[PDB]
Design a protein around this ligand. Structure first.
Ligand SMILES: [Cl-]
Ligand SMILES: [Cl-]
Lengths: 75, 75, 139, 82, 72, 91, 70
């Protein structure tokens, strides 16, 4: 039985989820939803109509830094 | 649409910079390097969390270290 | 010319000796953890077999155990790990309470701290003190 | 005998665990259990049939550096052995 | 470089703990370490108070600063 | 690589290590790595109430980051040498 | 700035640490990471002021906030 090795596990996936709302949680204890417009390799990403749950507020186009991102899921 | 390009696009434009912790910085984006470390003009310093507390009206330039930068907001 | 080293000073050298042995692990959140160490790496990422989580209570001389299983521990979260000793590990060990209570009491006891420390600290900086206390570093 | 015998690495187990189920704990305290669909050398991973504790979901991506420890299937060591 | 233009000025250096330190900027580097002269410390803003003053040079550890900003 | 080199001249000697806990552990030093992670041998902590297993442990290996202080005797190394080595360091 | 540290090497320096603590000692060595050695040092933990001294201590850079002269 083939012993797999480390595998862009989502980077191609970044392509897949575009144009749709997604859920992002960031270091610090703050998450945010919003339609994903653009994305890069380093996972930095652009989100429209961003809402920032804190522990909500509207915010327009934004760039979230993919060096602080923690988990990304669809909403 | 590319994130950095979005920030390249932003230069010379009023920008908000939200940090992992409950603290927002707003002013004019003078420019940013690869680590996304940000340079800001006439920056207002905010700690939020509702009632907002303004901390300083930074007159002149500021080097804001990118570690903490979580979301960049045009305007 | 060349300066020799007496011992193998590397992370791997220290860790390897505990392989296939039973070790303790202290987590940054304060979880105690016991088990037999299978494999590890230079970043001290560990795999434990027959892992067992163990809340202590020397105040009232009681302890709890819960069977954890096979865990892969990401190393940055470890305060310290040690090779146990089945020679001096039977006499030291109290009546043992049921676990479910422990997490409950542990949560309340460990929780009450976060607030208190986070409240008694916040009022330290305003004076010129440095008391950084998070909810993940309570070991 | 997974170490000296196979010179195994933690990553090499999590890499072979695809399609198995695992409970991940994140530095937040959040418990995430789902079905591992993929993993990377930095230990970031995608999961399926995710259930997130503290929102049932279908897929999810996690960062390697915000993991605490991963609880895995009991038989996993056996599977690697063969 | 902001740092070159910046060098020699009265700057503000805020640290992670939010302790503000105001001084004349003798030197700085790549890890973002910061040398000052006659640095005084306030919790969030100078107006807020003074908790300490240093009549001598100060060294601040790059990992702790969130910003360097010129006093005007 | 100066502090790394420092300790190896400190191997096989007694010392105490105050964690960010405030916890203090005394033991004989057995190893270091360039990460200034510490391995010790003859354990005896001060707060033997919170950690009651530190008695049945042959070995403990400590992550550097957790450390706050390491306490040593004066007679354990050269102040002139340290200062000299520190001078040469590029940094 | 690392050098400014070279300047006062072997002299009394003041260190302010993350942990509600503050220290004084002669400075014997220092590191790009700020790991520091202090011969003849004394420290001040707040709580409201307490002190403990040891002939020599290694200080973990991770904790160090700022260094200066007393
Ligand atoms: Cl080193
Ligand atoms: Cl180091």
């Amino acid at each position: 039985r083939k012993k797999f090795e480390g595998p862009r596990e989502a980077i191609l996936d970044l392509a897949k989820y575009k144009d749709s709302k997604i859920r992002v949680k960031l270091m610090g204890g703050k998450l945010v939803i919003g339609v994903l417009k653009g994305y890069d390799q380093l996972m930095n990403l652009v989100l429209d109509d961003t809402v920032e749950y804190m522990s909500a507020r509207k915010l327009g186009l934004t760039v979230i830094r993919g060096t602080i991102l923690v988990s990304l899921s669809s909403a | 649409i590319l994130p950095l390009e979005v920030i390249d696009k932003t230069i010379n434009q009023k920008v908000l910079i939200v940090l992992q912790s409950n603290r927002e910085f707003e002013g004019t984006l003078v420019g940013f390097d690869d680590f996304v470390n940000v340079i800001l003009e006439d920056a207002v310093e905010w700690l939020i969390d509702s009632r907002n507390e303004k901390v300083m009206q930074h007159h002149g330039r500021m080097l804001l270290s990118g570690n903490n930068i979580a979301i960049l907001v045009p305007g | 010319d060349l300066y020799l080293d007496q011992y193998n000073f590397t992370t791997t050298a220290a860790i390897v000796s505990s392989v296939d042995r039973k070790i303790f692990v202290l987590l940054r959140d304060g979880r105690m953890l016991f088990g037999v160490l299978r494999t590890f790496d230079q970043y001290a990422n560990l795999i434990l077999q027959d892992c067992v989580e163990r809340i202590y209570f020397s105040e009232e001389n009681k302890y709890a155990e819960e069977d954890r299983g096979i865990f892969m521990i990401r190393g940055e979260n470890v305060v310290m790990l040690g090779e146990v000793d089945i020679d001096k590990e039977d006499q030291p060990l109290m009546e043992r309470i049921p676990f479910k209570e422990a997490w409950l009491t542990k949560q309340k006891n460990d929780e009450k701290r976060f607030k208190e420390e986070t409240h008694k600290g916040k009022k330290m900086a305003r004076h010129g003190i440095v008391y950084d206390f998070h909810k993940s570093d309570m070991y | 005998n997974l170490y000296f015998q196979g010179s195994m690495l933690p990553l090499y187990l999590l890499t072979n665990a695809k399609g198995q189920q695992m409970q991940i704990e994140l530095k937040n305290g959040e418990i995430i259990q789902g079905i591992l669909t993929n993993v990377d050398n930095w230990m970031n991973l995608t999961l399926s049939n995710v259930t997130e504790y503290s929102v049932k979901l279908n897929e999810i991506y996690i960062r390697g550096t915000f993991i605490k420890f991963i609880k895995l299937q009991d038989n996993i060591i056996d599977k690697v052995k063969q | 470089e902001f740092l070159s233009d910046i060098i020699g000025k009265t700057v503000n250096v805020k640290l992670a703990s939010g302790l503000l330190y105001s001084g004349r900027l003798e030197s700085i580097d790549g890890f973002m370490n910061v040398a000052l002269s006659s640095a005084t410390e306030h919790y969030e803003s100078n107006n807020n108070k003074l908790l300490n003053k240093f009549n001598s040079d100060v060294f601040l550890r790059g990992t702790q600063v969130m910003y360097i900003s010129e006093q005007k | 690589m100066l502090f790394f080199s420092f300790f190896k001249t400190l191997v096989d000697q007694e010392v105490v290590v105050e964690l960010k806990n405030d916890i203090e552990i005394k033991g004989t030093l057995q190893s270091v790595d360039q990460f200034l992670n510490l391995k010790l041998d003859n354990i005896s902590s001060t707060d033997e109430k919170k950690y009651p297993h530190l008695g049945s442990v042959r070995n403990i290996f400590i992550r550097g980051s957790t450390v706050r202080y390491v306490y040593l005797n004066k007679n354990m190394v050269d102040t002139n040498l340290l200062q000299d080595a520190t001078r040469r360091e590029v940094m | 700035p690392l050098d400014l540290l070279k300047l006062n090497l072997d002299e009394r320096v003041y260190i302010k640490l993350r942990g509600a603590r503050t220290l004084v000692g002669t400075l014997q060595a220092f590191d790009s990471h700020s790991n520091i050695v202090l011969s003849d040092a004394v420290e001040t933990i707040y709580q409201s002021e307490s002190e403990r001294r040891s002939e020599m201590v290694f200080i973990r850079g991770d904790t160090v906030t700022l260094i200066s002269t007393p």
